[PDB]
Design a protein around this ligand. Structure first.
Ligand SMILES: O=C(Nc1nc(-c2ccccc2)cs1)c1ccccc1Cl
Ligand SMILES: O=C(Nc1nc(-c2ccccc2)cs1)c1ccccc1Cl
Ligand SMILES: O=C(Nc1nc(-c2ccccc2)cs1)c1ccccc1Cl
Ligand SMILES: CCCCCCCCO[C@@H]1O[C@H](CO)[C@@H](O)[C@H](O)[C@H]1O
Ligand SMILES: CCCCCCCCO[C@@H]1O[C@H](CO)[C@@H](O)[C@H](O)[C@H]1O
Ligand SMILES: CCCCCCCCO[C@@H]1O[C@H](CO)[C@@H](O)[C@H](O)[C@H]1O
Ligand SMILES: N[C@@H](CCC(=O)N[C@@H](CS)C(=O)NCC(=O)O)C(=O)O
Ligand SMILES: N[C@@H](CCC(=O)N[C@@H](CS)C(=O)NCC(=O)O)C(=O)O
Ligand SMILES: N[C@@H](CCC(=O)N[C@@H](CS)C(=O)NCC(=O)O)C(=O)O
Ligand SMILES: CCCCCCO[C@@H]1O[C@H](CO)[C@@H](O)[C@H](O)[C@H]1O
Ligand SMILES: CCCCCCO[C@@H]1O[C@H](CO)[C@@H](O)[C@H](O)[C@H]1O
Ligand SMILES: CCCCCCO[C@@H]1O[C@H](CO)[C@@H](O)[C@H](O)[C@H]1O
Lengths: 148, 148, 148
């Protein structure tokens, strides 16, 4: 199998795919909150679900969208950086630690965001998860630059 | 050519690139709507196009942005999942079906969103397109986990 | 090293990673602006930083978010297109020009956006950067289609 193209690749693919699924979970929750709070973004949606007054914003829906947006600001870059990093021959354990810190940090971020946990819990989880991303980015820079 | 690295790869690259172009089409439409409705996000844009009163929101511009945002929530994960999936040796026809369902579902989603089609047309197209994504995600999980 | 899988790959990886770092810079600036202007998205953040009145929108924060959103609309597609394009055996110099135009255009875009530069400076930088993306997309289409 091509999953074994590099020793770190299976771990990367596991963590990344779990994170994509975690984003889908946020999308599912968003839809459920819209229905429960009757807060739809579009007049055509609202008319199907009780009337035009239900085309409206809701703080919980907005919170869900912020969590999803933050995921797009952070998880998408990881999908790129982690994939490339997997092929740079990093120490297997060190690579695992990079991926695990990101996975744990981001799952915790979503829990802290949607669960409305006190500050600075969410901020800390964001910062923690960005650390391995910064690390991988710099490593890719050096490897790319030296092969120019 | 490296497009033939796997039997499913050409089909994946065709569908994905068409979807990226489809997102660019949404960006183009957004710009056109801003100009036609004179609804700009920035004061510097507004002053160039008639005066400060044109720094304002517009429902059609907001709708365009929602379509583009939903694309980012769905097409970007597909770019990752579909690429990885292409190298897992899936049945060529089965892989084609995954990619085609996503392509058709997402093009239909944009038509339903921007065309303001009645509910639940847009919701159905979203759900249909997410099915092959869920399928690919699970397959990657099993392959990654078993190579740990 | 696997960075030399294709002659254009090192240049692509350099430009892409710099652009990811440039997006992280926007995220950092956004956080700094929120703190300076005391404009937080969440009640729990506001209570930590002076009181509930600081859960509020701010034009500079909104501008930062627009720059970041536009990055997600443009840089993320480049990460995909440029990676694939690197393996299609393009002329090394021509490939470098594609990547450099995108890098320069996007850095200029962020400067023009956050610096509130007069129209049409930002619009021009956006359009300039999209040109190599359109070019790569079409090239991938032809290569993918011909291998079906
Ligand atoms: O009405 C909604 N979804 C639906 N989805 C379906 C559906 C989707 C796939 C298969 C069958 C039915 C039938 S109504 C909806 C939910 C949240 C927000 C807005 C809307 Cl417009
Ligand atoms: O004025 C706008 N675009 C322009 N683009 C150009 C341009 C771009 C590339 C090459 C030449 C001219 C010249 S004015 C604009 C459109 C939608 C929203 C906001 C603005 Cl600020
Ligand atoms: O208060 C904030 N960040 C913090 N971050 C920390 C922190 C993060 C990582 C390690 C140590 C402390 C401690 S307070 C904050 C900033 C902008 C917006 C909202 C918030 Cl809630
Ligand atoms: C990967 C998806 C993570 C979902 C985590 C959701 C956390 C929900 O947690 C809930 O949050 C509520 C406030 O929103 C609180 O009132 C509840 O006490 C708490 O159980
Ligand atoms: C890939 C890009 C897809 C663009 C599809 C745009 C669909 C436009 O469709 C139009 O929608 C209008 C409402 O917005 C209706 O008034 C018109 O009858 C309809 O033609
Ligand atoms: C990659 C990150 C790029 C950051 C570029 C920030 C540009 C800041 O530039 C500043 O913009 C201010 C208005 O916002 C002006 O008042 C100042 O004159 C100008 O120096
Ligand atoms: N787009 C972010 C940029 C900075 C960021 O990601 N901050 C973290 C830690 S405070 C966060 O969780 N932001 C909340 C959010 O993006 O909604 C923002 O607006 O805050
Ligand atoms: N971010 C989405 C999450 C759920 C979702 O993607 N729903 C589909 C089917 S109702 C959709 O088209 N949402 C409209 C949108 O994202 O603007 C939302 O706010 O609705
Ligand atoms: N989502 C974009 C689509 C078009 C676009 O990307 N336009 C460029 C040139 S005017 C831009 O910088 N848009 C500002 C933005 O996205 O906030 C928009 O709303 O304008
Ligand atoms: C907030 C910034 C986090 C810093 C990440 C550190 O990242 C480290 O950078 C070093 C120098 O580039 C590298 O030698 C090392 O491999 C890398 O892990
Ligand atoms: C809404 C959830 C959609 C379900 C997608 C089904 O996806 C299927 O999952 C099976 C078990 O993991 C796999 O054996 C199979 O290859 C895959 O197509
Ligand atoms: C706004 C549209 C920009 C046009 C990009 C041009 O892109 C060009 O397209 C040609 C035909 O597909 C290709 O032969 C060529 O390799 C490519 O650079």
């Amino acid at each position: 199998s091509l999953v074994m193209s590099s020793p770190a690749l299976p771990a990367f693919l596991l963590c990344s795919t779990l994170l994509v699924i975690k984003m889908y979970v946020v999308a599912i929750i968003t839809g459920q909150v819209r229905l429960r709070k009757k807060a739809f973004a579009n007049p055509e949606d609202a008319l199907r679900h009780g009337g035009p007054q239900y085309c409206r914003s809701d703080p919980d829906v907005e919170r869900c969208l912020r969590a999803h947006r933050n995921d797009m600001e952070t998880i998408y870059p990881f999908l790129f950086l982690g994939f490339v990093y997997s092929f740079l021959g990093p120490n297997p354990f060190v690579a695992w630690m990079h991926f695990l810190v990101f996975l744990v940090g981001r799952v915790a971020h979503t829990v802290a965001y949607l669960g409305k946990l006190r500050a600075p819990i969410r901020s800390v989880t964001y910062t923690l998860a960005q650390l391995p991303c910064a690390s991988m980015a710099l490593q890719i820079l050096w490897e790319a630059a030296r092969h120019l």
